[PDB]
């Protein structure tokens, strides 16, 4: 019965909202009320990497904070070395429309994907001496919007056909498929223990999926536009999502509730990338204002601006040790800040 | 003295410089190719259109490439057929395209849309046109409007008047008064009158004039942008 089902779904929504309120108390601002602020964080451009002559759409640091990989729509993946500038590898792509890249934790594989609906897994350590296409995973209908490694033999992709998929590099098939999103999925962020992963769709929602069984566990809602970037808190118990309404929100896994919103009545453009810093005190968000901002994860006040970019910034990363922050915009020129 | 690098690091610098050059030489070859988009309303002669300028180059894949060469000019043409997702997310990828071919079949004025009612195909194509023509990205990009299915429309005019699609039409139901009216109705949606231009064209004739038209128009766009966006620089 459509009417009966709608009524009971409405009552379930009412009761879940009532429970979320029933677990509500004083928020972060009522606990951060008395703590000295960090101050003013001034950053400087330590290095500048050039040679892409196109738009930069992704980047990912390695486990050791020395090597990074960048993807651009000139048909190029480039493995920069953060110290100095030399390039270790320049991989050409069969499809020149790429929107994702990823560095394997072991450092042996790289990944790419785009409008071709196909995820390419490139090998790096070969006998012959060249970078080969180790695997070409196909099976998605829409474009690939995010792609993150989980091991040396598993990989989680989130695509534009409103689905996520946990693959299996050896066999090549979808080991598991996560569905439940009524919109395009454009984000992905794995937990430090690599058992739960959260994804933000195009319908203003963030879902926490369990990798083992493959069933949705928690849904966090509230926004005024799409979601473009998601990143886990280093503790692995919270995350921060960036949207198109110039607001970055913080959600908690154990509370099922919003905690803080880092919004100012001076910025109207959306957010293209979001990334925490080590120890979980600074939230770095890249905007369409050709610059990125640094927010206090507790006091929710701006405390720094990095404005060395000409066009819109599209990718933002923080190294594992927290030494530096690397940004990439739509006019090449990856910049490392410290 | 500057000689603080080992032999291996100097070889690494050698590798880096070889790489970037190879990259620069490759990227130079990718700037001499004219890139076109292939937007179409669907259920048109898009397959016939791509076949017409394919002979000159003697799951869902999504983006489909088509390379061809005419009069020592290299055209890459991108077709997006299988993309059923939201258009607001990947439409800014084609920011630097030279021109947007827009295919419209002028035989669907009376044929209502399938899996729907009271929604003509021509109205949907008009909405698509006044949905990409006013994009904040495609502001200086020209549109080449292709108008297909000449013979079928010519036959259908004598059987079905044009008053069904355009009840406000006042002219006679024949040729040279319906095609021109359709083109005029398709040209008023161009809000950016001062920057972009519409190179309307009639086609479906089994000739080789379609590729010649694309050639002419792309040459004009190129010249105008050069002489407007460049000074002394």
């Amino acid at each position: 019965e459509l009417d009966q089902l709608r009524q009971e779904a409405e009552q379930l929504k009412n009761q879940i909202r009532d429970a979320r309120k029933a677990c509500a108390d004083a928020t972060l601002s009522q606990i951060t009320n008395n703590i000295d602020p960090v101050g003013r964080i001034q950053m400087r451009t330590r290095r500048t990497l050039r040679g892409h002559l196109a738009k930069i759409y992704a980047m990912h640091w390695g486990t050791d904070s020395r090597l990074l990989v960048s993807a651009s729509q000139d048909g190029k993946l480039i493995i920069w070395d953060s110290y100095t500038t030399n390039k270790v590898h320049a991989i050409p792509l069969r499809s020149s429309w790429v929107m994702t890249c990823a560095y394997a934790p072991s450092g042996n594989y790289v990944a790419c994907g785009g409008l071709d609906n196909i995820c390419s897994i490139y090998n790096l350590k070969t006998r012959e001496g060249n970078v080969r296409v180790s695997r070409e995973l196909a099976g998605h209908t829409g474009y690939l919007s995010c792609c993150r490694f989980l091991d040396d033999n598993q990989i989680v992709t989130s695509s534009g056909d409103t689905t996520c998929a946990l693959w299996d590099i050896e066999t090549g098939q979808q080991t598991t498929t996560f569905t439940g999103h009524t919109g395009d999925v454009m984000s992905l962020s794995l937990a430090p223990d690599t058992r739960l992963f959260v994804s933000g769709a195009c319908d203003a929602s963030a879902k926490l999926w369990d990798v083992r069984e493959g069933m949705c566990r928690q849904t966090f809602t509230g926004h005024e536009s799409d979601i473009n970037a998601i990143c886990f808190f280093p503790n692995g118990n919270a995350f921060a999502t960036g949207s198109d309404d110039a607001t970055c929100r913080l959600f908690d896994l154990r509370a099922d509730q919003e905690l803080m919103t880092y919004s100012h009545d001076n910025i109207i453009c959306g957010i293209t990338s979001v990334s925490f810093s080590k120890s979980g005190r600074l939230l770095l968000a890249g905007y369409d204002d050709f610059n990125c901002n640094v927010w206090d994860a507790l006091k929710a006040d701006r405390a720094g601006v990095l404005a060395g970019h000409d066009n819109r910034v599209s990718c933002l990363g923080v190294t594992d040790d927290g030494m530096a922050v690397a940004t990439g915009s739509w006019d090449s020129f990856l910049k490392i800040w410290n | 003295m500057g000689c603080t690098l080992s032999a291996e690091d100097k070889a690494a610098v050698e590798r880096s410089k070889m790489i970037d050059r190879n990259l620069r030489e490759d990227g130079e070859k990718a700037a001499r190719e004219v890139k076109l988009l292939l937007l179409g309303a669907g259920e048109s002669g898009k397959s016939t259109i791509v076949k017409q300028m394919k002979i000159i180059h003697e799951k869902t894949t999504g983006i489909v490439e088509t390379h061809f060469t005419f009069k020592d000019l290299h055209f890459k043409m991108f077709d997006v057929g299988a993309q059923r997702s939201e258009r607001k997310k990947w439409i800014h990828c084609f920011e630097g395209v030279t021109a947007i071919i827009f295919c419209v079949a002028l035989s669907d004025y009376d044929l209502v849309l399938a899996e729907d009612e009271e929604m003509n195909r021509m109205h949907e194509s008009m909405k698509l046109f006044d949905s990409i023509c006013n994009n904040k990205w495609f502001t200086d990009t020209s549109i080449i409007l292709f108008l297909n299915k000449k013979d079928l429309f010519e036959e259908k005019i004598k059987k079905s008047p044009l008053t069904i699609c355009y009840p406000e039409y006042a002219g006679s139901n024949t040729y040279e008064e319906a095609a021109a009216y359709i083109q005029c109705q398709f040209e008023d949606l161009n809000k950016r009158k001062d920057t972009k231009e519409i190179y309307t064209h009639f086609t479906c004739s089994t000739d080789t004039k379609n590729v010649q038209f694309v050639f002419d128009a792309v040459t004009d766009v190129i010249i105008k942008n050069n002489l407007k966006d460049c000074g002394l620089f």
């Epitope: 020395r66 270790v88 012959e128 001496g129 | 291996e8 070889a11 050698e14």
Partner: single-chain antibody, 233 residues
């Protein structure tokens, strides 16, 4: 299938000329730097010449400079050594060695099978005091190499390499940068050391580990080998 095959060796009258070839079969000749390495009939290894990838950088041993020329034919995947005014000091086994230099690479990893030349009748010194040592299978043995100059560079890398030559076989690299294990070399090998003093440890030595072990340096490109520590029994 990565084999490098040498050819052109043989008996040559003193003062003559001979050309040695090295036909790479089964990988990209380009994107690699090449080295020649010489071994007297009853003496250790001795580097001869080096040509970088793209032929942009070339180096020679001072005992062969002026007489020798090294070259590569990348389309044909061949490496050439043209050899003139052959003295009696040039009778040896010549080995063709590949080496690729980028961050984290393994230079000198693969060695060719070598060709024989018989001619009818400053530099860092690598010291291996132990000319031979008796070892029983199952035991653990340590080989010591000593340097006349600190191999540890300012960038953190200590350019020491360990190679194993089983008798009647080509040299096989064991360790690069004094600590990193090669691919396909069992974990029972290990390398350690401070500046100017290095040790290679074989734990639970078993058969096919017997032979001559060489220590080679690269603090500065010039590479000199050790005398060679030989293991038997």
């Amino acid at each position: 299938d990565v084999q490098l095959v040498e050819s052109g060796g043989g008996l040559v009258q003193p003062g003559g000329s001979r050309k040695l070839s090295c036909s790479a079969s089964g990988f990209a000749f380009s994107s690699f730097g090449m080295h020649w390495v010489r071994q007297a009939p009853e003496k250790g290894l001795e580097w001869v010449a080096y040509i970088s990838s793209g032929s942009g950088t070339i180096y020679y041993a001072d005992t062969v400079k002026g007489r020798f020329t090294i070259s590569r034919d990348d389309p044909k995947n061949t490496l050439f050594l043209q050899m003139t005014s052959l003295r009696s000091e040039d009778t040896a086994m010549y080995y063709c060695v590949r080496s690729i230099y980028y961050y984290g690479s393994s230079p000198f990893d693969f060695w060719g099978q070598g060709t024989t030349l018989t001619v009818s009748s400053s530099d860092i010194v690598m010291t291996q005091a132990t000319s031979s040592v008796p070892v029983t299978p199952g035991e653990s043995v340590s080989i010591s190499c000593r340097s006349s100059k600190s191999l540890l560079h300012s960038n953190g890398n200590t350019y020491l390499y360990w190679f194993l030559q089983r008798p009647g076989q080509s040299p096989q690299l064991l360790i690069y940068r004094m600590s990193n294990l090669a691919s396909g070399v069992p974990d029972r090998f290990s390398g350690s050391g401070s500046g100017t003093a290095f040790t290679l440890t074989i734990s639970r030595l078993e058969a096919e580990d017997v032979g001559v072990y060489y220590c080679m340096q690269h603090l500065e490109y010039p590479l000199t080998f050790g005398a060679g520590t030989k293991l038997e029994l």
